[PDB]
Design a protein around this ligand. Structure first.
Ligand SMILES: CCCCCCCCO[C@@H]1O[C@H](CO)[C@@H](O)[C@H](O)[C@H]1O
Length: 337
């Protein structure tokens, strides 16, 4: 058990091991406040996040546990990972706070696209890193479900990590089937998001800046064209169907005419990501082997994950059960190399 010290930072008492120093609040991020701190053990600067009311409710408690499980599991260069987790509590009876420690990040993808104008070499490397991490995530049977610029960290060296949550409307990046509340959707919902992000990186503009979920569908159909017979057959919702069939057909634009001036190989990959039919959407693994990434692809350096047990997602438990499970996970944490 490390030696802890206490400190009032704006709002609350922070209690952290003496190994973490010069704590300096950097804002409210990804449900809980975050200080940057100096890790005297490694000589590196880090982010320490104190979770906000981790056990306020069944909902909060289960998400504290979800988030500890996920962050403990992710071990990959392009996905946020866990350097440390701790609590000042010494016993389950005292257990109220959870602190998570990760690399200090600084900027998200949104911060980058907003100043500069990205060259093709940059889009290749950013997208490559997204897909590489997404292959890993997908191979755990996890679907991210919220890929968007503010959930992607990018340092000064243009190295990227997929985030659990923000350091940019979700709707702009959401697969059309989620927008129609279609159940059973597969991994490829993330591949659609990656297509929207890629398009934005090439053009400087949000691909489909919808004002609500209906507008969003309009904008999406302007680009890809009204669904073919084979796809309407699958809809079920009669209002979705009448909505899609109403308005004058505006069928498939020429991606080449929309991305005029982008590398033709980027246009081709885009067409394969941004397919309505999620059955026919290119996978993270397939996309990695697309000639667009010939400069970066290495099939022996694109690793997959240990299978992730997410059955707990299928339980309704008591707050003290969720809290006891999280407690076991704090206690059993093994720090990285
Ligand atoms: C833009 C308005 C039309 C959107 C049509 C969305 C096509 C989605 O694709 C569909 O996804 C389903 C759920 O994963 C699968 O069950 C279907 O097989 C698949 O074709």
């Amino acid at each position: 058990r490390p030696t802890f010290y206490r400190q009032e930072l704006n709002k609350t008492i922070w209690e952290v091991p003496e190994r973490y120093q010069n704590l300096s609040p950097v804002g409210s991020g990804a449900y809980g406040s975050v200080c940057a701190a100096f890790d005297t053990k490694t000589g590196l600067r880090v982010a320490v996040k104190k979770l906000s009311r981790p056990f306020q409710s069944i909902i909060h408690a289960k998400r504290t546990y979800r988030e500890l499980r996920l962050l403990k599991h992710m071990k990959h260069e392009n996905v946020i990972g866990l350097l440390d987790v701790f609590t000042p509590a010494r016993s389950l009876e005292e257990f109220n706070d959870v602190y998570l420690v990760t690399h200090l990040m600084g900027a998200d993808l949104n911060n980058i696209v907003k100043c500069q104008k990205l060259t093709d070499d940059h889009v290749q490397f950013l997208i490559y890193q997204i897909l590489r991490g997404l292959k890993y995530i997908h191979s755990a049977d996890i679907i991210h479900r919220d890929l968007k610029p503010s959930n992607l960290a990018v340092n000064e060296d243009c190295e990227l990590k997929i985030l659990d949550g923000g350091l940019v409307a979700t709707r702009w990046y959401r697969a059309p089937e989620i927008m129609l509340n279609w159940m059973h959707y597969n991994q490829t919902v993330d591949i659609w998001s990656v297509g929207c992000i890629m398009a934005e990186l090439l053009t400087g503009r949000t691909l489909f800046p919808g004002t609500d979920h209906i507008d969003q569908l309009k904008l999406i159909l302007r680009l890809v064209g009204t669904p073919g017979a084979e796809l309407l057959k699958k809809i079920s919702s009669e209002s979705a169907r009448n909505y899609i069939q109403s308005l004058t057909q505006m069928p498939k634009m020429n991606f080449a005419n929309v991305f005029i001036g982008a590398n033709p190989l980027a246009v081709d990959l885009l067409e394969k990501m941004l397919v309505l039919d999620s059955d026919k959407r290119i996978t993270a693994a397939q996309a990695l082997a697309h000639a667009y990434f010939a400069q970066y692809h290495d099939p022996d350096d694109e690793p997959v994950a240990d299978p992730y047990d997410q059955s707990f997602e299928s339980r309704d438990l008591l707050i003290d059960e969720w809290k006891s499970l999280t407690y076991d996970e704090v206690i059993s944490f093994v720090p990285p190399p």
